[PDB]
Amino acid sequence: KHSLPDLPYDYGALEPHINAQIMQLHHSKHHAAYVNNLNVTEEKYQEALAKGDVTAQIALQPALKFNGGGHINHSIFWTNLSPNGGGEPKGELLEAIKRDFGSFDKFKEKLTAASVGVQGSGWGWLGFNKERGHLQIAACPNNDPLQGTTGLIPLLGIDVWEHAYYLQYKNVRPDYLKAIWNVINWENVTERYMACK
Amino acid sequence: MKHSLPDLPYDYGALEPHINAQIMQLHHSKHHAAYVNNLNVTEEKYQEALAKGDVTAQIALQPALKFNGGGHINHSIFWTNLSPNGGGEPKGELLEAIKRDFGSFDKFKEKLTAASVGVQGSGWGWLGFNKERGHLQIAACPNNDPLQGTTGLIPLLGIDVWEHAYYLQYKNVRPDYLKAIWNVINWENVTERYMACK
Ligand SMILES: [K+]
Ligand SMILES: [K+]
Ligand SMILES: [K+]
Ligand SMILES: [K+]
Ligand SMILES: [K+]
Ligand SMILES: [K+]
Ligand SMILES: [K+]
Ligand SMILES: [K+]
Ligand SMILES: [K+]
Ligand SMILES: [K+]
Ligand SMILES: [K+]
Ligand SMILES: [K+]
Ligand SMILES: [K+]
Ligand SMILES: [Mn+2]
Ligand SMILES: [Mn+2]
């Protein structure tokens, strides 16, 4: 049974950048539903596999990817933010950002652009490409998770579903993207990067 | 338990001159055999991932499961949908339903032909049964995506329009294959599948 992780901080800890009502809904309603539906779907898959029911396995794929991906993505996202965040990373991650994107500021522009560019629901990611040994930006639709659908290892995700920002920023997704940089937990992103090497 | 390649219920040359023996043997003994085997490999990996709660691994396996699982589902139906005893028109309640839902048998053939010719890339044309609406319905599916798993419709008749289903004999002219296949449709099987829905 997958479980809803506790947040690493309280729901208001990322104010004013992401308001407490959003964090509370996002974790306690949206992520909770992913977890609950993921568990239901995995149990149905166990049954289908035991019976050799390939039709049922395939019919369950959309629920599995959506809720499973929701669980994967949100579990990473909470750790990617912190009340003590903001600013720039240091060390090898900063070195890699400068090497692969030219500068920290150009990296921000490129992840911002990928995130603002999602049409519909989805996510922007900074990932690590293990084959190539370098950083890579990608966008993913809906809750499709980065590693399961692209092979890239997730380092930093930005949720651009409307429920991630709408109560506060309404349609103005770019204002949310500007604000979120103030709460990036570069410690966590660095840990994820260093685990890849 | 493991999925198995069903034997083809007739000789590889039983459908000549409509589908030749070289196609039938490659399609069954090479293409379908590979789907079954790859499906069983993917299922095994999926069980492991599920036991470990590895959702990333489950999602990464979805393309192979749908493609090879769908391949197994669709080809298993297809072999039974063809017969040397086939061709002609169905009878009874299936014919009545075709006339009711499509206007006539020939109109139905045109619509299923159009759906099958219209696949861009690899895929299948299907006649299915919509259990909720209680009537027949035509759909096209990409690659090996299977009808029931992706649409909920119950498959009655499938036509494979992957190039391996026809290319050796008909080359690029997919409409020549589709003309030919009507001569070997096993309407007895299609009828059985339809009656099982009702
Ligand atoms: K907050
Ligand atoms: K703000
Ligand atoms: K988790
Ligand atoms: K540089
Ligand atoms: K999704
Ligand atoms: K958010
Ligand atoms: K079998
Ligand atoms: K013969
Ligand atoms: K497929
Ligand atoms: K069926
Ligand atoms: K064929
Ligand atoms: K011919
Ligand atoms: K012909
Ligand atoms: Mn979200
Ligand atoms: Mn085929």
Numbering used by the authors:
A (entry chain B): 1 to 197
B (entry chain A): 0 to 197
Lines from the paper:
As the only known mitochondrial enzyme capable of converting reactive radicals into diffusible products that can be further metabolized or exported, MnSOD serves as the critical first line of defence against oxidative stress. Substitution with Asn stalls catalysis because the increased distance from WAT1 disrupts critical proton-coupled electron-transfer (PCET) events, and the redox cycling of the active-site metal is impaired.
In addition to H2O2 binding at the canonical LIG and PEO sites in the treated Gln143Asn enzyme, our results reveal a striking accumulation of five distinct cryo-trapped H2O2 molecules, either fully or partially occupying the space between the solvent-exposed enzyme surface and the Tyr34–His30 solvent gate. These new bulk-exposed peroxides, named Lb for Ligbulk binding sites, identified in this study have never been observed in any other peroxide-soaked MnSOD. To validate that the observed Lb densities truly correspond to H2O2 molecules, rather than misassigned or mobile waters, we performed a trial refinement in which we replaced each Lb peroxide in the treated structure with a fully occupied water molecule, as in the resting state. In addition to the Lb H2O2 molecules on the solvent-exposed surface, we observe H2O2 binding at the metal-ligated LIG position and at the PEO position at the mouth of the active-site solvent-funnel gateway between second-shell residues Tyr34 and His30. Overall, H2O2 treatment does not appear to significantly alter the active-site architecture of Gln143Asn MnSOD, except for the partial displacement of the manganese-bound solvent (WAT1) by a partially occupied (∼35%) H2O2 molecule bound at the LIG position, opposite His26.
